């Protein structure tokens, strides 16, 4: 394994947002929709990418 550049994608980002607001912040139940996305990466993503200052 040597992916390294494990960048996200439109679908994942959208699903993450649509899920997060519905579940609230139950990352365990949100990742149920995205098993290929671990909590660490999800939150890291939710903290780094989504916080682009809307």
From Swiss-Prot:
Domain HTH myb-type, first and last residues per copy: 4-54
Superkingdom of origin organism: Eukaryota
DNA-binding region: 27-50
Post-translational modification: SUMOylated by TRAF7; leading to MYB transcriptional activity inhibition.
Subcellular localization: Nucleus
Assembly description: Binds to HIPK1. Interacts with HIPK2, MAF, MYBBP1A and NLK.
Function comment: Transcriptional activator; DNA-binding protein that specifically recognize the sequence 5'-YAAC[GT]G-3'. Plays an important role in the control of proliferation and differentiation of hematopoietic progenitor cells.
Domain notes: Comprised of 3 domains; an N-terminal DNA-binding domain, a centrally located transcriptional activation domain and a C-terminal domain involved in transcriptional repression. C-terminal truncated mutants display increased transactivation.
Protein name per Swiss-Prot or TrEMBL: Transcriptional activator Myb
Organism: Mus musculus (Mouse)
């Amino acid at each position: 394994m040597e992916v390294k550049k494990t960048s996200w994608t439109e679908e994942e980002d959208r699903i993450l947002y649509q899920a997060h607001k519905r579940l609230g912040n139950r990352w365990a139940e949100i990742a149920k929709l995205l098993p290929g996305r671990t909590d660490n990466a999800i939150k890291n993503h939710w903290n780094s990418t989504m916080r682009r200052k809307v």
